[PDB]
Amino acid sequence: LTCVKSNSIWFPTSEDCPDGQNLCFKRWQYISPRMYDFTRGCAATCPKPTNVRETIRCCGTDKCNK
């Protein structure tokens, strides 16, 4: 699998996931209206929110987390 990788520093790029990681994730954290922190990458299992302002979506096709 290949996923989009991005975070607060790095602009979105393609990344090849390690063998055995067959999900891509997109995670967003609400700050205020229409203002979010986004993170994207590969995962083995879908990550879970660390706080109630976070939402995560996972998917299983190349770069589906764009």
Author numbering: 1 to 66
From the paper:
Three chimeras were obtained by substituting loops of the MT7 toxin with the corresponding loop from the MT1. These chimeras were named MT7-1/1, MT7-1/2 and MT7-1/3, numbered for the respective grafted MT1 loop. The comparison of loop 3 from each of the two molecules in the asymmetric unit of MT7-1/3 compared to MT1 shows again an excellent match. The comparison of loop 2 from chain A of MT7-1/3 with loop 2 of MT1 shows that the replacement of loop 3 of MT7 for that of MT1 imposes a reorientation of the side chains to match that of MT1 although there is poor sequence identity. The situation with loop 3 is different because of the conserved interaction between loop 2 and the second strand of loop 3. To preserve the interaction we have observed that the side chain orientations on the top part of loop 2 tend to conform to those from the parent toxin. Indeed, in chimera MT7-1/3 the side chains on loop 2 execute a concerted rotation and adopt conformers that match closely those on MT1 loop 2. By least-squares fit we have an rmsd for MT1 vs MT7-1/3 of 2.87±0.08 Å while by SSM the value falls to an rmsd of 0.89 Å on 61 aligned residues with a 79% sequence identity. While loop 1 transfer has no significant effect on the toxin affinity for hM4, a moderate gain of function (5-fold) is observed with the grafting of loop 3. Notably, a two orders of magnitude increase in affinity for the α1A-adrenoceptor is achieved for chimeras MT7-1/1 and MT7-1/3 by the grafting of loop 1 or 3.
